[PDB]
């Protein structure tokens, strides 16, 4: 069984496109891969954060992932800072990185140092679990290139204990787009909020956002990305939130107009966010969330600990006991 | 009671000038200060080290310090990498350091990154114990300046939990110099090894090095640094290894020549290294060394742990439990 590792910025709420595109897939793939879901609070603080806001968003993300259907006895879900291994391994991998290397990543009162020196810590976050696959996008290429390099350097200079990862996503999800700009993916940080639907939107507001999506005035409900990207996008959302093949949706809306369909979808989105958000509050506001992240921290420690100890011995840190 | 923190590179053996100048003092001051002696193996690896050589030199330094008379129930003597707090706190203090800051320190196949990013980790090594005083020399000024700055930044941006240190050495020792160049201090890395006496020299060899010291052909045994620095230096060694006031040595050698005196000192050095080195082997080669460094690690953890946890809470890492 391969091991999957995804780190999760606890900075912003995932959109529903982030649900369709990634989180929903995870809930399958956690039965076919040994998945590590890591809320990277120590990465969070390289960028600016509000001390109080930041400890909150971490529970938010943990609950969001638990609501999505991540199962704590199938994946490991944990907060980075609570696994010391991460910054230990990160330091080792920093001593073999070059300055020029860390500088190049930055290309692809002062400049906070975390913005320069996170790359080795990202590497350590992966390799501690002997991760084979990392589900990330094209702005993360330079990172995985350096993680592969840093594993090669470490296995050559010191003993071979690390595991080069590949960038892979087991079941790719459907490309959701901006509701009021279908040629651009759905970002949680859109200046135009009618462009996205947060998993933590007021359901009614998401409903009105579906209705607000830029589409032609009327049309058939037929998937055509190249020429009718407006309605095509909404059909992707519809299919994604319901598991209805796109040709089945097309079938069910044969001879219906945009209005009938948009109204149905707008009730599906509203329906779904209520099922999600009632799960989400029941986790975010629950004593069992501390129990779960405790279990998920101990899991991730037990694994990463042995990776750090193999690394220390390989470089001559510490003692022999 | 103030708290003293000294980090100890495990890279080279201390000279006897390092004993007179620093280590001997520590054996007093550990009754008047809460002393943390930290063998910085994680600093060791920013520079190049042999994986096998490096884990050895760490026991060497631990034994050297224990032989010197550091007492494990009065100071805390520990290996850095075995206290996770160090790289945890180091990471926090890195996110608030600037790039320009770390770059400036460097002034006072590629450039290993540890050489740029150790400063915050040096800071963390100090502040985790709320250290008031750090016994270091003038090439360490820029470091303590930055540690004071990084504590000020942390106590302003987040809660006030850190303790700015001062550079202080409680009982200064006597300035030993190079045996064959008395105008230059005694370095362990001299290309000319007749210049220094290692605490791990063959005692006879150290004897012959005393005899070899550049002095006038004959003279009175009178302390005169400015004009007879040769014999003056040896008198400093003599006084330092024996606790005989310099005016008492002068007294005891009244009407004796360099030859009588050099011979006496050469037997004192030889005598002393045998008392030391028999202590040193009995530690370096002893099962109790693991017990001692274990006790010294647990001590240092219990203290540093609470400092990291106060820091995490102050920045919003982790959870509230």
Author numbering:
A (entry chain A), B (entry chain A): 1 to 108, 117 to 329
What's the paper's own text on this?
To ensure rigorous structural comparative analysis, we also determined the structures of SaTrpRS in the absence of substrates or inhibitors (apo-SaTrpRS) and SaTrpRS in complex with Trp (SaTrpRS/Trp complex) at resolutions of 3.04 Å and 2.32 Å, respectively (ESI†). These structures share a similar three-chain asymmetric unit with the SaTrpRS/CXM complex. The CXM complexes show high conformational similarity to Trp complexes and apo proteins (ESI†).
Chuangxinmycin (CXM) is a promising antimicrobial compound targeting bacterial tryptophanyl-tRNA synthetase (TrpRS), an essential enzyme in protein synthesis. TrpRS catalyzes the ligation of Trp to its cognate tRNA, forming tryptophanyl-tRNA (Trp-tRNA), which is required for the accurate translation of genetic codes into proteins. Importantly, bacterial TrpRS exhibits significant structural and functional differences compared to its mammalian counterpart, making it an attractive target for the development of selective antibiotics. Structurally, CXM is a tryptophan (Trp) mimic but is characterized by a unique dihydrothiopyran heterocycle, which distinguishes it from other known antibiotics and contributes to its distinct physicochemical properties.
